[PDB]
Coordinates of C-alpha atoms and ligand atoms in Angstrom, one line a residue:
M102 CA -18.5 -30.8 0.2
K103 CA -19.9 -28.1 -2.0
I104 CA -19.0 -25.8 -4.9
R105 CA -18.5 -22.2 -3.8
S106 CA -18.8 -18.9 -5.7
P107 CA -15.7 -17.9 -7.6
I108 CA -13.8 -15.0 -6.0
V109 CA -13.3 -12.1 -8.4
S110 CA -10.9 -9.3 -7.4
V111 CA -11.3 -5.8 -8.9
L112 CA -7.9 -4.2 -9.6
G113 CA -6.9 -0.9 -11.2
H114 CA -5.5 2.6 -10.8
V115 CA -6.7 5.1 -8.1
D116 CA -10.2 6.2 -8.8
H117 CA -10.6 4.4 -12.1
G118 CA -13.7 2.9 -10.4
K119 CA -13.0 -0.3 -8.4
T120 CA -15.4 0.5 -5.5
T121 CA -18.1 2.1 -7.6
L122 CA -18.3 -1.0 -9.8
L123 CA -18.9 -3.3 -6.9
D124 CA -21.4 -0.8 -5.3
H125 CA -23.4 -0.8 -8.5
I126 CA -23.4 -4.6 -8.7
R127 CA -24.6 -4.7 -5.1
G128 CA -27.3 -2.2 -5.9
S129 CA -28.6 -4.4 -8.8
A130 CA -28.9 -7.4 -6.6
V131 CA -30.6 -5.5 -3.8
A132 CA -33.2 -3.8 -5.9
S133 CA -34.1 -7.1 -7.6
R134 CA -34.4 -9.6 -4.7
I135 CA -28.9 -10.4 -0.3
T136 CA -26.2 -11.3 2.2
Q137 CA -24.0 -8.3 2.9
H138 CA -20.2 -8.7 3.3
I139 CA -17.3 -6.5 4.6
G140 CA -15.2 -5.3 1.7
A141 CA -16.9 -7.7 -0.8
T142 CA -20.1 -8.1 -2.8
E143 CA -21.9 -11.3 -3.3
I144 CA -24.2 -11.6 -6.4
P145 CA -26.4 -14.7 -6.5
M146 CA -26.7 -16.7 -9.7
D147 CA -30.4 -15.9 -10.2
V148 CA -29.5 -12.2 -10.1
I149 CA -26.7 -12.8 -12.7
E150 CA -29.1 -14.8 -15.0
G151 CA -31.5 -11.9 -14.6
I152 CA -29.0 -9.3 -15.8
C153 CA -27.4 -11.5 -18.5
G154 CA -30.0 -12.6 -20.9
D155 CA -29.8 -15.9 -22.8
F156 CA -26.2 -14.8 -23.4
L157 CA -25.4 -17.1 -20.5
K158 CA -27.1 -20.3 -21.7
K159 CA -23.9 -21.4 -23.5
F160 CA -22.2 -21.9 -20.1
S161 CA -23.1 -25.1 -18.4
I162 CA -21.2 -24.0 -15.2
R163 CA -24.1 -21.6 -14.7
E164 CA -26.1 -24.5 -13.3
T165 CA -23.6 -25.4 -10.6
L166 CA -22.5 -22.1 -9.1
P167 CA -24.1 -20.2 -6.2
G168 CA -23.1 -17.0 -7.9
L169 CA -20.0 -14.7 -7.9
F170 CA -18.2 -13.2 -5.0
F171 CA -16.4 -9.9 -5.7
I172 CA -13.7 -8.4 -3.5
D173 CA -12.5 -4.8 -3.7
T174 CA -8.8 -4.1 -3.6
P175 CA -8.3 -3.3 0.2
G176 CA -6.5 -0.2 1.5
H177 CA -4.9 2.1 -1.0
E178 CA -4.1 0.0 -4.1
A179 CA -3.0 -2.9 -1.9
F180 CA -3.3 -5.6 -4.6
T181 CA -0.7 -7.8 -3.1
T182 CA -2.7 -8.4 0.1
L183 CA -5.2 -10.5 -1.9
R184 CA -3.3 -13.8 -1.5
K185 CA -3.6 -17.2 0.1
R186 CA -1.3 -20.2 0.6
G187 CA -1.8 -21.8 -2.8
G188 CA -1.5 -18.5 -4.7
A189 CA -3.9 -15.6 -5.3
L190 CA -6.9 -15.3 -3.2
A191 CA -9.0 -14.6 -6.2
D192 CA -10.0 -17.2 -8.8
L193 CA -10.7 -14.5 -11.4
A194 CA -10.0 -10.8 -11.7
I195 CA -11.4 -7.6 -13.3
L196 CA -8.7 -5.1 -14.3
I197 CA -10.5 -1.8 -14.5
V198 CA -9.1 1.1 -16.4
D199 CA -10.6 4.5 -17.2
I200 CA -11.3 4.2 -20.9
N201 CA -10.6 7.9 -21.2
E202 CA -7.3 8.0 -19.3
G203 CA -6.0 4.6 -20.3
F204 CA -3.1 2.7 -18.5
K205 CA -1.6 4.5 -15.4
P206 CA 1.1 3.2 -13.1
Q207 CA -1.1 1.1 -10.9
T208 CA -2.8 -0.4 -14.0
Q209 CA 0.7 -1.8 -14.9
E210 CA 1.3 -2.9 -11.4
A211 CA -2.0 -4.8 -11.3
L212 CA -1.4 -6.4 -14.7
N213 CA 2.1 -7.7 -13.7
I214 CA 0.6 -9.3 -10.5
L215 CA -2.2 -10.9 -12.5
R216 CA 0.3 -12.2 -15.1
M217 CA 2.6 -13.4 -12.2
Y218 CA -0.1 -15.4 -10.4
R219 CA -1.6 -16.6 -13.7
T220 CA -5.1 -15.4 -12.7
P221 CA -7.6 -15.3 -15.6
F222 CA -9.0 -11.8 -16.0
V223 CA -11.1 -9.5 -18.2
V224 CA -10.4 -5.8 -18.7
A225 CA -13.3 -3.4 -17.9
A226 CA -12.8 -0.2 -19.9
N227 CA -14.7 2.1 -17.4
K228 CA -16.4 5.5 -17.7
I229 CA -17.7 5.2 -21.2
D230 CA -20.5 7.6 -20.1
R231 CA -17.8 10.3 -20.1
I232 CA -16.9 9.9 -23.8
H233 CA -17.9 13.2 -25.4
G234 CA -21.3 12.9 -27.0
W235 CA -22.2 9.6 -25.3
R236 CA -25.9 9.3 -24.6
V237 CA -26.7 7.2 -21.5
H238 CA -29.1 4.2 -21.7
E239 CA -29.3 3.0 -18.0
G240 CA -28.1 -0.5 -17.2
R241 CA -28.4 -1.7 -20.8
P242 CA -26.0 -4.2 -22.3
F243 CA -23.0 -2.6 -24.0
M244 CA -24.1 -3.9 -27.5
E245 CA -27.4 -2.1 -27.0
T246 CA -26.3 1.3 -25.8
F247 CA -23.3 1.4 -28.2
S248 CA -25.6 0.7 -31.3
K249 CA -27.6 3.8 -30.3
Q250 CA -24.6 6.1 -30.2
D251 CA -23.8 8.4 -33.1
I252 CA -21.3 6.8 -35.5
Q253 CA -18.5 9.2 -34.6
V254 CA -19.0 8.5 -30.9
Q255 CA -18.8 4.8 -31.6
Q256 CA -15.6 5.5 -33.6
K257 CA -14.1 7.4 -30.7
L258 CA -14.8 4.6 -28.3
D259 CA -13.2 1.9 -30.5
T260 CA -10.2 4.2 -30.8
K261 CA -9.7 4.2 -27.0
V262 CA -10.2 0.5 -27.0
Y263 CA -7.6 -0.1 -29.6
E264 CA -5.1 1.9 -27.6
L265 CA -5.7 -0.5 -24.7
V266 CA -5.1 -3.4 -27.2
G267 CA -1.9 -1.8 -28.2
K268 CA -0.7 -1.4 -24.6
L269 CA -1.8 -5.0 -23.7
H270 CA 0.1 -6.3 -26.8
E271 CA 3.2 -4.4 -25.7
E272 CA 2.7 -6.3 -22.3
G273 CA 2.6 -9.7 -24.0
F274 CA -1.2 -10.0 -23.9
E275 CA -3.3 -10.3 -27.1
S276 CA -6.8 -8.8 -26.7
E277 CA -9.9 -7.4 -28.3
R278 CA -13.2 -5.9 -27.4
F279 CA -15.1 -9.0 -26.0
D280 CA -17.3 -9.4 -29.1
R281 CA -14.4 -9.4 -31.5
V282 CA -12.4 -11.9 -29.6
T283 CA -11.4 -15.1 -31.5
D284 CA -9.8 -17.5 -28.9
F285 CA -11.4 -16.7 -25.5
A286 CA -8.7 -18.9 -23.9
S287 CA -5.7 -16.8 -25.1
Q288 CA -7.1 -13.3 -25.8
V289 CA -8.1 -10.9 -23.0
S290 CA -11.6 -9.8 -23.4
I291 CA -12.1 -6.0 -23.0
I292 CA -15.6 -4.9 -22.0
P293 CA -16.6 -1.2 -22.2
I294 CA -18.7 -0.2 -19.3
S295 CA -19.9 2.5 -17.0
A296 CA -19.8 1.8 -13.3
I297 CA -22.1 4.7 -12.5
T298 CA -24.5 3.9 -15.2
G299 CA -25.0 0.1 -15.5
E300 CA -23.9 0.2 -19.2
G301 CA -22.0 -2.9 -20.3
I302 CA -22.3 -4.6 -16.9
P303 CA -24.3 -7.4 -18.5
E304 CA -21.5 -8.4 -20.8
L305 CA -19.0 -8.0 -18.0
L306 CA -20.7 -10.6 -15.9
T307 CA -21.2 -12.8 -19.0
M308 CA -17.4 -12.7 -19.7
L309 CA -16.6 -13.5 -16.0
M310 CA -19.0 -16.5 -16.3
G311 CA -17.1 -17.4 -19.5
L312 CA -13.8 -17.4 -17.6
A313 CA -15.4 -19.7 -14.9
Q314 CA -16.6 -22.0 -17.7
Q315 CA -13.0 -22.1 -19.0
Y316 CA -10.8 -22.4 -15.9
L317 CA -12.5 -23.2 -12.7
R318 CA -13.3 -26.7 -11.5
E319 CA -11.5 -28.3 -8.5
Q320 CA -10.5 -24.9 -7.0
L321 CA -14.2 -24.1 -6.2
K322 CA -14.6 -27.1 -4.0
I323 CA -14.9 -26.4 -0.3
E324 CA -15.7 -28.4 2.8
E325 CA -18.5 -26.3 4.4
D326 CA -17.9 -28.1 7.8
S327 CA -14.1 -27.7 7.9
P328 CA -12.5 -25.1 10.2
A329 CA -12.4 -21.9 8.2
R330 CA -9.4 -20.8 6.3
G331 CA -9.1 -17.2 5.1
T332 CA -6.9 -14.1 4.7
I333 CA -6.8 -10.9 6.7
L334 CA -7.3 -7.9 4.4
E335 CA -7.2 -5.1 6.9
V336 CA -6.6 -4.5 10.6
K337 CA -8.0 -1.2 11.7
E338 CA -9.8 0.7 14.5
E339 CA -13.6 1.2 14.5
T340 CA -15.3 3.6 16.9
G341 CA -16.6 1.9 20.0
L342 CA -14.8 -1.3 19.2
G343 CA -11.1 -1.5 19.4
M344 CA -8.8 -2.7 16.7
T345 CA -10.8 -4.9 14.3
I346 CA -9.9 -7.5 11.6
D347 CA -11.5 -7.4 8.1
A348 CA -11.1 -10.8 6.4
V349 CA -12.2 -13.0 3.6
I350 CA -12.9 -16.7 4.2
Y351 CA -12.3 -18.9 1.2
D352 CA -13.0 -22.4 2.7
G353 CA -14.9 -23.8 5.7
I354 CA -17.0 -22.1 8.4
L355 CA -16.1 -19.5 10.9
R356 CA -18.1 -19.3 14.1
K357 CA -18.6 -16.6 16.7
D358 CA -17.0 -18.6 19.5
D359 CA -14.1 -19.8 17.4
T360 CA -10.4 -19.4 18.3
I361 CA -8.4 -18.1 15.3
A362 CA -4.7 -18.0 14.6
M363 CA -2.8 -15.3 12.6
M364 CA 0.6 -13.8 12.3
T365 CA 1.8 -10.6 14.1
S366 CA 4.9 -8.7 13.2
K367 CA 6.6 -10.9 15.9
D368 CA 5.1 -14.4 16.0
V369 CA 2.0 -16.5 15.4
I370 CA -0.8 -16.0 17.9
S371 CA -4.4 -17.1 18.4
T372 CA -7.3 -15.3 20.0
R373 CA -10.9 -16.1 21.0
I374 CA -13.5 -14.2 18.9
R375 CA -16.0 -12.0 20.7
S376 CA -18.2 -11.3 17.6
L377 CA -18.5 -11.5 13.8
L378 CA -19.9 -8.4 12.1
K379 CA -21.3 -7.7 8.7
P380 CA -22.5 -4.4 7.2
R381 CA -26.1 -3.7 8.2
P382 CA -28.4 -3.2 5.2
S383 CA -31.4 0.6 16.0
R384 CA -28.8 3.0 14.4
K385 CA -26.0 0.3 14.4
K386 CA -23.7 0.2 11.4
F387 CA -22.9 -3.5 11.9
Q388 CA -25.1 -6.6 12.4
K389 CA -23.9 -9.6 14.5
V390 CA -24.0 -13.1 13.0
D391 CA -23.3 -16.4 14.6
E392 CA -21.2 -17.8 11.7
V393 CA -20.3 -17.4 8.1
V394 CA -19.3 -20.1 5.6
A395 CA -16.6 -20.0 3.0
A396 CA -17.2 -17.4 0.5
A397 CA -17.5 -14.6 2.9
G398 CA -16.1 -11.1 3.9
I399 CA -16.3 -10.5 7.6
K400 CA -15.2 -8.1 10.3
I401 CA -13.9 -9.8 13.4
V402 CA -13.7 -8.4 17.0
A403 CA -11.2 -10.2 19.2
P404 CA -8.7 -9.1 21.9
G405 CA -5.2 -10.2 21.0
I406 CA -4.9 -8.1 17.9
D407 CA -3.4 -4.6 17.3
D408 CA -0.2 -6.0 15.8
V409 CA -1.8 -8.5 13.5
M410 CA -0.4 -8.1 10.0
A411 CA -2.5 -7.3 6.9
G412 CA -2.1 -10.2 4.5
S413 CA -1.8 -12.8 7.3
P414 CA -3.3 -16.3 6.8
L415 CA -6.4 -16.7 9.1
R416 CA -7.2 -20.1 10.5
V417 CA -9.7 -21.4 13.0
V418 CA -8.0 -23.6 15.6
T419 CA -9.0 -27.2 16.4
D420 CA -5.3 -28.4 17.0
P421 CA -3.1 -25.5 18.1
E422 CA 0.4 -26.9 17.4
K423 CA -0.8 -28.3 14.1
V424 CA -2.1 -24.8 13.1
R425 CA 0.9 -22.9 14.4
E426 CA 3.2 -25.2 12.4
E427 CA 1.1 -24.8 9.3
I428 CA 1.2 -21.0 9.5
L429 CA 4.9 -21.0 10.2
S430 CA 5.6 -23.3 7.3
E431 CA 3.5 -21.0 5.1
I432 CA 5.6 -18.0 6.2
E433 CA 9.0 -19.9 5.8
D434 CA 8.2 -20.9 2.2
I435 CA 8.2 -17.3 1.3
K436 CA 10.9 -15.9 3.7
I437 CA 14.2 -17.0 2.1
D438 CA 17.3 -16.8 4.2
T439 CA 20.5 -18.4 2.8
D440 CA 24.0 -17.2 2.4
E441 CA 24.5 -18.1 -1.2
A442 CA 24.2 -15.6 -4.0
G443 CA 23.0 -12.1 -3.0
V444 CA 20.2 -9.5 -3.0
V445 CA 18.2 -8.3 0.0
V446 CA 14.5 -7.9 -0.2
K447 CA 12.1 -6.3 2.4
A448 CA 8.4 -5.8 2.1
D449 CA 5.5 -4.7 4.3
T450 CA 3.3 -7.8 4.0
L451 CA 3.6 -11.5 3.3
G452 CA 1.8 -11.0 0.1
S453 CA 3.9 -8.0 -1.1
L454 CA 7.0 -10.0 -0.1
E455 CA 5.8 -13.0 -2.1
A456 CA 5.1 -10.8 -5.1
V457 CA 8.5 -9.2 -5.2
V458 CA 10.3 -12.5 -4.6
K459 CA 8.3 -14.0 -7.5
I460 CA 9.0 -11.1 -9.9
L461 CA 12.7 -11.2 -9.0
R462 CA 12.8 -14.9 -9.7
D463 CA 11.3 -14.5 -13.1
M464 CA 14.2 -12.0 -13.6
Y465 CA 16.6 -14.7 -12.6
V466 CA 17.9 -12.4 -9.8
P467 CA 19.1 -14.5 -6.8
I468 CA 18.0 -13.5 -3.3
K469 CA 19.9 -13.9 -0.1
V470 CA 17.4 -12.2 2.2
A471 CA 13.5 -11.9 1.8
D472 CA 11.7 -10.7 4.9
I473 CA 9.0 -8.4 6.3
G474 CA 9.6 -5.1 8.0
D475 CA 11.6 -1.9 7.9
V476 CA 15.2 -2.1 6.7
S477 CA 17.3 -3.1 9.7
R478 CA 21.0 -2.8 10.5
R479 CA 21.1 -6.6 10.0
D480 CA 19.7 -6.2 6.5
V481 CA 22.4 -3.8 5.5
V482 CA 25.1 -6.1 6.9
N483 CA 23.8 -9.0 4.7
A484 CA 23.7 -6.7 1.7
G485 CA 27.3 -5.8 2.5
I486 CA 28.2 -9.5 2.5
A487 CA 26.5 -9.7 -0.8
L488 CA 28.1 -6.5 -2.1
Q489 CA 31.2 -8.7 -2.3
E490 CA 31.1 -10.9 -5.4
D491 CA 29.2 -8.8 -7.9
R492 CA 28.5 -5.4 -6.6
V493 CA 25.3 -6.2 -8.4
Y494 CA 23.9 -8.1 -5.4
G495 CA 25.0 -5.3 -3.0
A496 CA 21.4 -3.9 -3.0
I497 CA 18.4 -3.7 -0.8
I498 CA 14.9 -3.7 -2.4
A499 CA 12.4 -2.3 0.1
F500 CA 8.8 -2.3 -0.9
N501 CA 6.5 0.1 1.0
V502 CA 8.7 -0.1 4.1
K503 CA 10.6 2.4 6.1
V504 CA 14.3 2.4 7.0
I505 CA 15.2 2.1 10.7
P506 CA 17.6 5.0 11.7
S507 CA 20.4 2.7 13.0
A508 CA 20.2 1.2 9.5
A509 CA 20.1 4.5 7.5
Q510 CA 23.2 5.9 9.3
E511 CA 25.2 2.6 9.1
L512 CA 24.1 2.7 5.5
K513 CA 25.5 6.1 4.7
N514 CA 28.6 4.2 3.4
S515 CA 28.5 3.9 -0.4
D516 CA 28.7 0.6 -2.3
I517 CA 25.2 -0.5 -1.0
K518 CA 22.4 0.6 -3.3
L519 CA 18.9 1.1 -1.9
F520 CA 15.7 1.0 -3.8
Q521 CA 12.6 2.1 -2.0
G522 CA 9.1 2.5 -3.3
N523 CA 5.5 1.3 -3.2
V524 CA 5.4 0.3 -6.8
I525 CA 7.0 -3.1 -7.6
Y526 CA 7.6 -2.8 -11.3
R527 CA 9.2 0.6 -10.8
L528 CA 11.6 -0.9 -8.3
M529 CA 12.6 -3.6 -10.8
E530 CA 13.2 -1.2 -13.7
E531 CA 15.3 0.9 -11.3
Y532 CA 17.4 -2.1 -10.2
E533 CA 17.9 -3.2 -13.8
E534 CA 18.8 0.3 -15.0
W535 CA 21.3 0.1 -12.2
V536 CA 22.8 -3.2 -13.2
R537 CA 23.2 -2.1 -16.8
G538 CA 25.4 0.8 -15.7
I539 CA 27.5 -1.2 -13.2
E540 CA 28.1 -3.7 -16.0
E541 CA 29.2 -0.9 -18.4
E542 CA 31.5 0.6 -15.8
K543 CA 33.1 -2.8 -15.3
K544 CA 33.5 -3.4 -19.0
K545 CA 34.9 0.1 -19.4
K546 CA 37.6 -0.6 -16.8
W547 CA 38.0 -3.8 -18.8
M548 CA 39.5 -1.9 -21.8
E549 CA 41.9 0.2 -19.8
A550 CA 43.9 -3.0 -19.2
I551 CA 43.9 -4.2 -22.8
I552 CA 46.5 -3.3 -25.4
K553 CA 45.0 -1.9 -28.6
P554 CA 46.2 -1.9 -32.2
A555 CA 48.4 1.0 -33.3
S556 CA 51.0 1.8 -36.0
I557 CA 53.8 4.3 -36.2
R558 CA 56.5 5.5 -38.7
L559 CA 60.0 6.7 -37.8
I560 CA 60.4 10.0 -39.6
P561 CA 63.8 9.9 -41.3
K562 CA 66.4 12.5 -40.4
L563 CA 65.0 13.0 -36.9
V564 CA 67.1 10.8 -34.7
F565 CA 67.9 12.5 -31.4
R566 CA 69.5 9.4 -29.7
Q567 CA 70.6 6.1 -31.1
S568 CA 71.1 3.7 -28.2
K569 CA 69.9 3.4 -24.6
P570 CA 66.7 5.3 -24.9
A571 CA 66.3 5.4 -28.6
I572 CA 64.8 8.8 -29.4
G573 CA 63.4 9.9 -32.7
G574 CA 60.7 11.8 -34.5
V575 CA 57.6 9.6 -35.0
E576 CA 54.3 9.8 -36.8
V577 CA 51.4 7.7 -35.5
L578 CA 50.2 6.0 -38.7
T579 CA 47.0 4.5 -37.2
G580 CA 45.5 3.8 -33.9
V581 CA 46.5 5.2 -30.5
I582 CA 50.0 4.3 -29.4
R583 CA 50.5 4.4 -25.7
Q584 CA 53.3 4.8 -23.1
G585 CA 54.4 1.2 -22.4
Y586 CA 53.0 -0.4 -25.5
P587 CA 55.3 -3.2 -26.9
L588 CA 56.5 -2.7 -30.5
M589 CA 57.6 -5.2 -33.1
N590 CA 59.0 -5.3 -36.6
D591 CA 57.4 -6.1 -40.0
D592 CA 58.4 -9.6 -39.0
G593 CA 56.8 -9.8 -35.6
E594 CA 60.2 -9.2 -34.0
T595 CA 60.0 -7.3 -30.7
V596 CA 61.9 -4.0 -31.1
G597 CA 61.2 -2.4 -27.7
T598 CA 58.6 -0.5 -25.6
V599 CA 57.3 3.0 -25.9
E600 CA 59.0 4.8 -23.0
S601 CA 57.9 8.4 -23.5
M602 CA 56.3 10.8 -26.0
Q603 CA 56.6 14.5 -26.6
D604 CA 54.4 16.7 -28.7
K605 CA 56.5 19.8 -29.3
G606 CA 56.8 20.7 -25.6
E607 CA 54.1 18.6 -24.1
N608 CA 54.7 15.2 -22.6
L609 CA 52.1 12.6 -23.8
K610 CA 50.7 9.4 -22.3
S611 CA 49.0 8.7 -25.6
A612 CA 49.2 9.8 -29.2
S613 CA 46.4 9.6 -31.8
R614 CA 46.7 9.3 -35.6
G615 CA 48.9 11.8 -37.6
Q616 CA 50.1 13.3 -34.3
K617 CA 53.9 13.3 -34.9
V618 CA 56.0 13.4 -31.7
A619 CA 59.5 12.8 -30.4
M620 CA 59.4 9.3 -29.1
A621 CA 61.7 7.4 -26.7
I622 CA 61.8 3.7 -27.4
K623 CA 63.4 1.6 -24.7
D624 CA 65.5 -1.4 -25.6
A625 CA 65.8 -0.3 -29.2
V626 CA 68.7 1.1 -31.3
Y627 CA 68.7 2.9 -34.6
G628 CA 70.8 1.4 -37.3
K629 CA 70.5 -2.1 -35.9
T630 CA 67.2 -3.0 -34.3
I631 CA 65.2 -0.1 -35.6
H632 CA 65.6 2.0 -38.8
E633 CA 64.7 5.4 -40.1
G634 CA 61.5 5.2 -42.2
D635 CA 60.5 1.8 -40.8
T636 CA 56.9 1.2 -39.8
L637 CA 56.6 -0.4 -36.4
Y638 CA 53.5 -2.1 -35.0
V639 CA 52.1 -2.8 -31.6
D640 CA 52.7 -6.3 -30.4
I641 CA 49.4 -7.2 -28.9
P642 CA 49.4 -10.3 -26.7
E643 CA 47.7 -13.5 -28.0
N644 CA 44.7 -13.5 -25.7
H645 CA 44.5 -9.7 -25.5
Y646 CA 43.9 -10.1 -29.2
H647 CA 41.1 -12.7 -28.9
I648 CA 39.2 -9.9 -27.2
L649 CA 38.8 -8.1 -30.5
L650 CA 37.8 0.3 -34.4
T651 CA 37.9 2.2 -37.7
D652 CA 38.5 0.9 -41.3
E653 CA 42.2 1.8 -40.9
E654 CA 42.4 -0.1 -37.5
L655 CA 40.6 -3.1 -39.0
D656 CA 43.0 -3.3 -42.0
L657 CA 46.0 -2.9 -39.6
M658 CA 44.3 -5.4 -37.2
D659 CA 44.7 -7.9 -40.0
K660 CA 48.1 -6.4 -41.0
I661 CA 49.3 -7.3 -37.6
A662 CA 47.8 -10.8 -38.0
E663 CA 49.8 -11.5 -41.2
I664 CA 53.0 -10.4 -39.6
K665 CA 52.5 -12.6 -36.6
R666 CA 51.2 -15.5 -38.7
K667 CA 54.5 -15.4 -40.6
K668 CA 56.4 -17.2 -37.8
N669 CA 53.3 -18.8 -36.3
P670 CA 49.9 -20.4 -37.0
Ligands
GNP56 N1 -18.6 9.3 -14.8 C1 -18.2 8.2 -14.1 N2 -17.6 8.3 -12.9 C2 -17.3 7.1 -12.4 C3 -17.4 5.8 -13.0 N3 -17.0 4.8 -12.1 C4 -16.5 5.5 -11.1 N4 -16.7 6.9 -11.2 C5 -16.3 8.0 -10.3 O1 -14.9 8.0 -10.2 C6 -14.5 8.3 -8.8 C7 -13.7 7.2 -8.2 O2 -14.4 6.0 -8.1 P1 -13.9 4.9 -7.0 O3 -15.0 3.9 -7.1 O4 -13.8 5.4 -5.6 O5 -12.5 4.5 -7.5 P2 -11.5 3.6 -6.9 O6 -10.7 3.0 -8.0 O7 -12.3 2.5 -6.1 N5 -10.6 4.3 -5.8 P3 -9.4 4.2 -4.8 O8 -8.2 3.5 -5.5 O9 -9.1 5.4 -4.0 O10 -10.1 3.0 -4.1 C8 -15.8 8.5 -8.2 O11 -16.1 9.9 -8.1 C9 -16.8 7.8 -9.0 O12 -18.1 8.3 -8.8 C10 -18.1 5.8 -14.2 O13 -18.3 4.7 -14.9 N6 -18.4 7.0 -14.8
MG57 MG1 -13.0 3.8 -3.7

């Protein structure tokens, strides 16, 4: 066994500097001493100790680590691909943000993923070299270059930093510029840097070493001789070679003659490796190696790929049915396929699928279907089944996936809501803003079937018909009397029901306050059951009442209570 280098991912919005940061870090190592990796950068502990002064001596872990292994976000902002069985592929993360631009959509996406997988991270506030008036001092520690800036320039920098603190606070994260931090364990450290210059990179590495000191122990243990375990980051064509696999190995050893298993869009497969390629420091872009040991980024050339899925687990095979079962189990634990509750989810990768499923669970939103691939006719059908019993579940959440024609058409039918997008948190805000509305609409239709409070007075001298339909001039004292509303006496005695109302020449379904109309009252009779001048009240049902307006309606609301309480509780 051995202790490997922590894996640090670099996340952030398009062009805030993810790649440039790693390229600079690689440059520092090269021009100071380095093994090259595909899509990653390995910086040795002596190089780190060289860049970070004695600021590292307070971290005993420094003595036991081979160094740090950085991995760039693969593809276009594909943060969710950086995963592995037990959680995130990275042990630590750097959330980079243009100090000048601040948080952008992908910054929020990265933050939510980091929060969700509980991965410790620091925030690198990049591009400080572009703050108006900044004077560059090449590769110097942030404290050193900052102290040489004009006071107002320093002030402008701290202002941008406090806007980051404000945003992070709104996100549930307390934070401060790394040197002002109080409890390293609970506050995010923000390190101002310049990926182009090397400014602040010294403190950046020091803080990452701090996080290793604080959180990493058992997770760094690997068995250098075990069959390699890794994750596929990209599957893509390379001139002269065919389809190729870019992968990170986090445990074990991968050899040139190994057989490896992975998932395809259809099933689990295995292939025999032709070669392992790493970037070359003969005008050949790659250099062949015989093997690489855990803590490596490698490009693999093998024949059975083309349909291999980004995000797929990668495993060297020593026992084929034992490995196929392991990979299948890994898939199943994320897939979800019951009948209970509702909500249909589709994503492009196992990692993006896992992320959405995780976020939805934290939102307490039940899921009936969670699977990979374009929205199918089958998906719509299951959503339909869910549509029943809470139209709330009658939805399909599709992350970075397309909709199969047969599905779109068969979907044209309303009642099934579809959310599509390549930004997870945007999909969730959209689903929730949808649920709010649906709920209001249901609650609205909830009132339409409930009798409200209302009061009316029988204008004396305006009796058009005594018996059978009683008809007389009425003035709505308070509330909104309606056609069909029950009416009772000052003693809770039922007098009759409002049969019809007429405002001058217009027939009304409802009458407001001081309206005054000719009203027909079924089952009532003047000079017996009802009397000229009398005030009548609406006889609201017991329960319909429990579901409790203006000051007038409130008073009456209690006025009705008294009346009913007379011959009751
Ligand atoms: N002035 C300045 N430019 C920087 C800095 N860091 C990166 N850049 C510039 O910003 C642009 C984007 O950098 P890049 O590293 O590709 O960003 P990204 O976040 O990796 N990109 P994408 O999401 O497409 O991968 C480049 O032109 C780069 O030179 C910095 O500290 N200062
Ligand atoms: Mg880039």
